[PDB]
Design an enzyme around this catalytic site. Structure first.
Site, PDB file in Angstrom:
ATOM      1  N   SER B  47       0.791  -1.232   0.000  1.00 14.41           N
ATOM      2  CA  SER B  47       0.000   0.000   0.000  1.00 14.41           C
ATOM      3  C   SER B  47       0.827   1.287   0.000  1.00 14.41           C
ATOM      4  O   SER B  47       0.231   2.355  -0.145  1.00 14.41           O
ATOM      5  CB  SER B  47      -0.964   0.047   1.191  1.00 14.41           C
ATOM      6  OG  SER B  47      -2.050  -0.869   1.038  1.00 14.41           O
ATOM      7  N   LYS B  50       0.210   3.298  -3.044  1.00 13.95           N
ATOM      8  CA  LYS B  50      -0.953   4.158  -3.174  1.00 13.95           C
ATOM      9  C   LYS B  50      -0.594   5.649  -3.129  1.00 13.95           C
ATOM     10  O   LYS B  50      -1.414   6.469  -3.556  1.00 13.95           O
ATOM     11  CB  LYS B  50      -1.990   3.774  -2.106  1.00 13.95           C
ATOM     12  CG  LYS B  50      -2.589   2.346  -2.298  1.00 13.95           C
ATOM     13  CD  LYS B  50      -3.669   1.998  -1.246  1.00 13.95           C
ATOM     14  CE  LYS B  50      -4.423   0.688  -1.536  1.00 13.95           C
ATOM     15  NZ  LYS B  50      -3.580  -0.544  -1.567  1.00 13.95           N
ATOM     16  N   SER B  95      -6.711   2.443   3.389  1.00 10.30           N
ATOM     17  CA  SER B  95      -5.966   1.656   2.415  1.00 10.30           C
ATOM     18  C   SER B  95      -6.923   0.752   1.632  1.00 10.30           C
ATOM     19  O   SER B  95      -6.740  -0.460   1.546  1.00 10.30           O
ATOM     20  CB  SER B  95      -4.861   0.856   3.120  1.00 10.30           C
ATOM     21  OG  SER B  95      -3.880   0.372   2.210  1.00 10.30           O
ATOM     22  N   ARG B 227       5.359  -1.345  13.453  1.00  8.87           N
ATOM     23  CA  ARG B 227       5.872  -0.477  12.393  1.00  8.87           C
ATOM     24  C   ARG B 227       6.017   0.959  12.873  1.00  8.87           C
ATOM     25  O   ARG B 227       7.085   1.563  12.737  1.00  8.87           O
ATOM     26  CB  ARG B 227       4.954  -0.530  11.177  1.00  8.87           C
ATOM     27  CG  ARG B 227       4.967  -1.864  10.467  1.00  8.87           C
ATOM     28  CD  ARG B 227       3.885  -1.938   9.454  1.00  8.87           C
ATOM     29  NE  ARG B 227       2.561  -1.688  10.004  1.00  8.87           N
ATOM     30  CZ  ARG B 227       1.473  -1.621   9.252  1.00  8.87           C
ATOM     31  NH1 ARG B 227       1.546  -1.702   7.930  1.00  8.87           N
ATOM     32  NH2 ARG B 227       0.287  -1.466   9.834  1.00  8.87           N
TER      33      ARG B 227
END
Ligand SMILES: [Cl-]
Lengths: 242, 242
Positions: B47, B50, B95, B227
Site C-alpha cells: 500500500s 498508493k 488503504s 511499524r
C-alpha cells in the site's frame, strides 16, 4: 435553522468565564450555539484575521509558498517565538505579528480592505492605518460570520485562487489523529475593551465537517488555554470527538 | 552520505523483530540507517504504492478532487471500513484496495508504468513479467528509494501538477500536534514471502523535515503496530520528537 442549547453554559461556568461557542453541522446545514445573541455580536478579529491576510499574501505572490523564510528583523519582542526566522506555517502557528505586518506593507492598505470586502469578511471599518487597522475603523466580525467565511474557504469559494486557499488550510493545521483533524486559528483581542479570546476553524471527520467559532471574555492571558478547552468540552458533549 | 547506527537494532531486538529504519535529515542532507544492506533491498511496495497511484489518478482526472465519492460496490470484504463509500482522504486512511483497483482500472497498466518510471519510483513497472510478476504493477522498491521519491513529492518536483502533489500530501496526513506533523503511508506485503510491513513518509518540524522509511518482517498481522512503534522509538532516541 439555528438551535440554542444552554447546557454548554456549564463548561463556561465551570471555569468561571463567559462566552459563546457556535457549531455548524455541514451535512445537515444546521447550527447550534449556547447564545444566539452573542453568536451574532461582532468583535475585533485579532489574529483570526491572519487567515484572510494569508490568503491575500499568497494570492498576490507576496508569499511565494509555505516555505519562503521571512527573516527576523533583530528587534527582540516579548513573545520569544517571534524572535526567530519564520515561514508561513510557523508564523500562523505562533501568530507572529511582525511577519504579518511586513506582509501587510507589501500588499497595501487599500488592496487589503478591498480584498477583505470581497470575502464578505465582517463589516466596514477601514482604518487604520497601513497594516493593523481599527482606529477610526476596525473590521468587526461575529462568530457566525466567521463560520460563513470559513465555509467558503473550506469549499474553495473565496475570491482568490484555489492554490492560495489550499495552502492557507494547510497552515491552519492544528491537530490530527485517527479520529479527527482540526484546522483552526486562535486570536486574542487586548487593545480595546472588552478583552476577548477567539478560536475558529473546523473539525474534519470521515463523513462530516463541523465548523466552529468561539469567543470568550479574556480579562487576562491566564485563561487562554480555555479557548480550546471549552470548545473540546462542547465537541465531546455533542459526540463529535471522543 | 549515509551513517550506519547499529544501536537502533535494539529496537527491533526488543520485539524479537527484524527490519530496517532509514532516516534523512533534509537540512544536513545526511542519511542514517541501522542496516545499509537491508536499506537498499527492494521489496514489493504494497500500500505504499498508493502514494504514487493517487498522484497519477489526480493528474489524469480519474480523481477530480479529494471530495469525489467512490461508492462501495456492494460486496462485503473482510475489512469493515472497506464496506462503505469513500473519497481520496478516507481511501488512503483505510488503504481501501477496491477503490484503488478502480483507479488502476481507469488508468491502465501502460500509463501507470510510464508515470511511475517518470517518478523514478522503484524499478520495472509494466515490463514486469515471468516468475512472481503480477503484484504491485511489477514494482520493487527499497527504503532508500522510498526516501528519494518522498523528497521529490515534498518539494513538488514530480512530473505531475503542483495541485496533484498538494492534494496527495493532504491525504497522507497521519498525525499532528504542537511538536510535529507526520505524513506517511503504511503497507503490508503478504502475497510473497518473506512477509514485510512498511511505514514511509516524513516528520515536519518548525525548522526541519526528517524523511523516514522502514520495513520489517511481519509474519502475522498481530505485529503491525510495531511499524509505527519502532519508528517512533528511533525518532525519540534521535531527539527528533519528544
Ligand atoms: Cl494538511
Amino acid at each position: 435553522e439555528w438551535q440554542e442549547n444552554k447546557s454548554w453554559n456549564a463548561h463556561f461556568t465551570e471555569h468561571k468565564s463567559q462566552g459563546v461557542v457556535v457549531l455548524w453541522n455541514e451535512n445537515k446545514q444546521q447550527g447550534f450555539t449556547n447564545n444566539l445573541k452573542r453568536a451574532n455580536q461582532a468583535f475585533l478579529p485579532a489574529s483570526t484575521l491572519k487567515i484572510p491576510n494569508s490568503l491575500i499574501a499568497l494570492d498576490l505572490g507576496v508569499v511565494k509558498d509555505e516555505h519562503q523564510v521571512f527573516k527576523w528583523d533583530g528587534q527582540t519582542r516579548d513573545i520569544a517565538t517571534w524572535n526567530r526566522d519564520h515561514n508561513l506555517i510557523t508564523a500562523m502557528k505562533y501568530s507572529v505579528v511582525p511577519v504579518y505586518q511586513e506582509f501587510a506593507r507589501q500588499i497595501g492598505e487599500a488592496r487589503m480592505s478591498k480584498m477583505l470586502h470581497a470575502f464578505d469578511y465582517g463589516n466596514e471599518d477601514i482604518s487604520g492605518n497601513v497594516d493593523s487597522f481599527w482606529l477610526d475603523g476596525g473590521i468587526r466580525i461575529s462568530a457566525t460570520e466567521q463560520i460563513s467565511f470559513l465555509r467558503k474557504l473550506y469549499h474553495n469559494k473565496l475570491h482568490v485562487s484555489e492554490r492560495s486557499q489550499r495552502i492557507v488550510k494547510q497552515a491552519m493545521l492544528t491537530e490530527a489523529n485517527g479520529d479527527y483533524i482540526i484546522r483552526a486559528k486562535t486570536g486574542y483581542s487586548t487593545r480595546i475593551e472588552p478583552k476577548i479570546g477567539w478560536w475558529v476553524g473546523w473539525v474534519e471527520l470521515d463523513d462530516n465537517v463541523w465548523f466552529f467559532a468561539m469567543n470568550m471574555d479574556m480579562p487576562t492571558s491566564d485563561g487562554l488555554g480555555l479557548r480550546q478547552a471549552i470548545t473540546k468540552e462542547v465537541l465531546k458533549q455533542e459526540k463529535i470527538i471522543p
